[PDB]
């Protein structure tokens with residue numbers, strides 16, 4: 001028949017681009033294009049969702065980021081609103097991992113991967129450089145908590161040199177100002193490779209206090225995710241910092257096209273199935289679930305698009321991107337560069353040579369054993385005698401029956 | 410030091426000096442410490458130095 | 461002179477409610493609160509938003525309650541986001557509202573009268589007590605909240621003295637179709653006389669069908685479920701084996717204007733304790749469109765007092781989650797007919813039954829001693 005899809009964007013240009021994209025995919029069951037702008041308030045948009053859906057009887061809606069930098073809520077309302085009728089929605093630039101959940105957002109599949117897996121990749125950079133000891137530094141939040149969950153599952157996935165074995169995690173507090181306390185515990189430990197993942201704004205404070213803390217010289221090694229490089233963070237980053245980028249950072253039309261293609265590849269398999277009951281556009285009238293909701297989602301979960309403008313697009317077990325590509329970028333004398341490229345297990349180095357903070361050109365051992373350790377001890381009668389000191393500060397020296405000096409640490 | 414639940418949450422932590430070792434206040438327990446399953450779960454014990 | 465909105469959906473004794481509005485004594489604190497009722501049908505979210513906007517913009521609303529009659533939780537979630545993007549507290553006092561979401565915003569201010577999930581686990585253990593079923597096994601439906609359920613259960617079992625002997629926690633979901641065979645297999649290993657279930661009003665029918673398809677019937681078993689698979693006035697298919705037990709609260713004798721009085725009283729006493737001592741009162745010129753610029757007066761203090769309140773001797777202290785401290789609960793039983801006889805009352809960590817023994821449907825002997 002004729003099926004209609006909708007999307008919400010922030011550029012008339014990409015609107016015409018999506019129109020052209022569906023005109024082209026028409027070569028591959030007619031599809032009807034519908035699109036709406038965004039607004040500087042969740043109210044009008046939360047109205048527009050049915051204001052246009054009911055008009056169109058949509059079968060899937062596409063969504064991306066508005067000009068708002070954070071936009072932690074701009075993909076919220078449009079999601080669960082359609083969830084009110086099990087209307088599978090697709091997103092592009094939704095990285096903030098809230099939507100990672102299956103429960104709260106049973107009606108959401110994304111285009112890119114969320115920060116969780118871009119943490120997960122560090123496993124391989126650890127595998128190559130034979131590093132073993134890592135200080136994990138994350139903020140206290142749901143996001144950071146998910147990062148912990150992912151990385152811990154990853155490291156635990158070693159049931160078999162023991163490789164890596166994390167040895168501390170610091171519940172850095174969000175939004176704070178004074179930091180150095182935690183950094184002290186950081187310095188005292190025995191390792192150098194630290195992994196920091198936090199707000200794109202507070203890494204500035206972190207770098208400030210750390211450079212003041214002098215723990216940024218040689219021997220130290222860093223890693224970050226994505227948000228930690230850009231923004232004013234770059235204006236405080238010491239050299240040698242290693243950073244990670246996605247291969248398709250901000251390219252709307254690319255994902256738009258891949259999306260309309262994959263949804264065509266879906267609907268062509270959809271319309272040739274039995275019991276296909278149209279989701280009604282009567283959100284005011286109707287109040288039940290078109291079984292072609294979770295039915296639509298169950299059928300989506302098997303497709304494997306051949307090749308897009310972003311290469312092969314595959315979906316995970318939870319409804320998100322699978323097997324993207326990453327650029328292992330770097331900072332070099334206040335001049336960002338590229339160094340490597342990751343995809344899958346392939347971790348390809350390249351021409352330019354890596355550097356490490358302090359100017360060293362080796363791959364430092366990441367840790368040197370201490371030689372001044374501490375000791376605990378209880379007060380037990382024949383094993384550990386406890387006695388107050390003499391007035392001089394030490395305590396009086398005695399002798400056994402053999403007359404020998406008695407050690408009195 | 411033993412093990413126990415805390416804060417009426419699903420957190421089971423280690424009171425006492427053994428717990429101190431677990432958290433990073435020192436790196437050796439020289440004292441009349443005993444040996445048993447629970448403690449031997451995650452701490453490495455030297456060979457026994459007094460029976 | 462605060463404004464308080466009260467909405468209804470469905471059938472209800474509207475006049476009786478408007479009358480019981482003036483049921484209490486608000487003499488000794490300057491509030492003079494206004495009231496404004498509205499009825500409506502069950503059309504859509506947009507209706508809801510439009511209406512709440514009209515109310516808050518019109519009568520200088522500073523707090524809303526809500527009731528309903530269906531079995532839809534999404535609407536609740538919607539209202540949650542409302543309280544998110546809207547700095548006023550909201551009280552889901554009755555109906556499909558009071559169904560418990562998974563969580564709340566770190567900033568939203570929405571609450572609902574009803575048991576927590578931990579409250580239910582606790583009370584059902586207290587009922588495992590009086591009648592001495594000391595061995596059980598549990599099964600779930602992969603609704604994500606289940607992890608908290610089982611964890612609270614185990615971390616209350618491991619500590620105490622009595623001989624809690626649980627066995628073989630099981631986890632099943634055939635969300636992938638035609639996995640039902642696996643179900644019929646994985647359920648065969650339930651040797652305990654007591655089974656516990658966290659499921660959905662939809663799946664449970666099929667689940668009990670398969671259960672009788674294995675042998676677990678009212679001969680030598682007995683089941684327990686939380687309210688989230690029950691409806692008191694509601695009815696159920698025959699697949700529910702007779703004699704099923706579960707737990708709800710005192711709807712059967714509280715779901716009435718007195719709840720409305722309770723809500724009005726609580727918002728009033730909060731407004732009195734917090735705003736008088738602080739001498740301020742957040743009174744937005746309540747827009748609904750163009751509210752992103754209205755957060756200038758961060759609430760940040762109503763919460764700081766909305767949890768420590770009381771009146772009429774009844775304590776209404778609220779916990780951070782969205783449940784209360786302790787609401788009066790009831791335990792009900794499937795009878796011969798499809799009816800829920802009121803069996804047991806519960807309040808203040810205390811359980812009170814109407815029996816000393818469990819009526820059962822022969823190798824079960826009395827025995828004397830000395």
Ligand SMILES: *[C@@H]1O[C@H](CO)[C@@H](O)[C@H](O)[C@H]1NC(C)=O
Pocket residue numbers: 177178179180181209
């Ligand atoms: C942080 O606090 C320490 C003392 O705890 C103080 O010495 C230091 O100057 C403070 N720095 C910042 C950036 O707040």
Ligand SMILES: *[C@@H]1O[C@H](CO)[C@@H](O)[C@H](O)[C@H]1NC(C)=O
Pocket residue numbers: 250251252254309310
């Ligand atoms: C997006 O990517 C496509 C190919 O992948 C390219 O043709 C186009 O110019 C890119 N546009 C932007 C803005 O990056």
Ligand SMILES: *[C@@H]1O[C@H](CO)[C@@H](O)[C@H](O)[C@H]1NC(C)=O
Pocket residue numbers: 768769
């Ligand atoms: C609650 O309020 C009463 C009376 O105002 C006061 O005595 C009590 O300490 C308060 N408790 C809390 C937790 O605020």
